Write a protein that binds this DNA or RNA. Structure first.
Length: 271
DNA sequence: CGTCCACGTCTACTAGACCTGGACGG
């Protein structure tokens, strides 16, 4: 559930549902504290887009669909285990907490938002989270400007490894990407963030925040979410150079999140 | 049986909380 996997997921939904027509209600598992989706239509299509660590679904009634319904948008955050699967209607995984059902001509499938630990959330209304910065994958220059226009922000007083998690500037970067990013430039994870960014007012740190997650999108698959057996899991593991790898150091940032790295921890290291 | 760890917010006062399950230890 970092930016690459959000992106992959929206693109899986678009592709797998290209030719599906959904129908009926949208069903929530009972265990879920996320809201019920009040949405019913006899014939609708589902599409998606990603932004950072969020994804939006649009549910779009076809012409003449009943009952009446204007398109509806839902935005999802994946937590630590969210994902989407398309499965046979009677063979629902768990823990499929939100389900959309295909309509008759065809084998009965379900598009499921599947989330074991349940840190995922969805919101009615199709709005990106206020406060999240632009997507490092799809909004690169806006991302770069928002970081650079805002270096006085106290966010940047922190270690570069911590600032990379801050979704107000690095929307889409998570724990694995930060290790990978920093590793490509040997930037110690505990250099002050502002010092590493001030250089900018061969690729630099802000370019890698885009181009590194992009690499993962280009592997295709499920990225970090991909299961061992794993044709795509072995890919992702083979792509990783630093995160969890033998040889590397690791330390806890101040929020208890592990940062992996090689070499100098950097001036601000908890000591 | 256990303890620890995981791709991330979220919110009540920088810790806990929120969850399941895999790996490994005894």
């Amino acid at each position: 559930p970092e930016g690459p996997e959000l992106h992959l997921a929206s693109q899986f939904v678009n592709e797998a549902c290209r030719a599906l027509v959904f129908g009926g209600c949208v069903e929530k598992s009972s265990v879920s504290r996320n809201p019920e989706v009040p949405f019913e239509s006899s014939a609708y299509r589902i599409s998606a887009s990603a932004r950072g660590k969020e994804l939006r679904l649009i549910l779009s009634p076809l012409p003449g669909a009943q009952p009446q319904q204007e398109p509806l948008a839902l935005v999802f955050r994946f937590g630590m285990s969210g994902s989407f699967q398309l499965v046979p209607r009677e063979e629902l995984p768990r823990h499929a907490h939100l389900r959309f059902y295909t309509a008759p001509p065809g084998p009965r499938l379900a598009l499921c938002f599947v989330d074991i630990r349940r840190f995922g959330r969805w919101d009615l209304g199709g709005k990106w989270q206020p406060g999240r910065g632009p997507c490092v994958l799809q909004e690169y220059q806006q991302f770069r400007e928002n970081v650079l226009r805002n270096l006085a922000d106290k966010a940047f007083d922190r270690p570069i490894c911590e600032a990379l998690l801050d979704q107000r500037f690095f929307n889409g970067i998570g724990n694995y990407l930060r290790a990978e990013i920093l590793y490509r430039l040997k930037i110690p994870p505990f250099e002050k963030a502002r010092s590493v960014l001030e250089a900018l007012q061969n690729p630099d740190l802000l370019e890698l925040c885009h181009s590194v997650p992009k690499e993962v999108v280009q592997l295709g698959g499920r990225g970090y979410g991909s299961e061992s057996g794993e044709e795509d899991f072995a890919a992702f593991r083979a792509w990783l150079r630093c995160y969890g790898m033998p040889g590397m150091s690791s330390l806890q940032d101040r929020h208890g999140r592990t940062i992996w790295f090689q070499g100098d921890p950097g001036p601000l290291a908890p000591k």
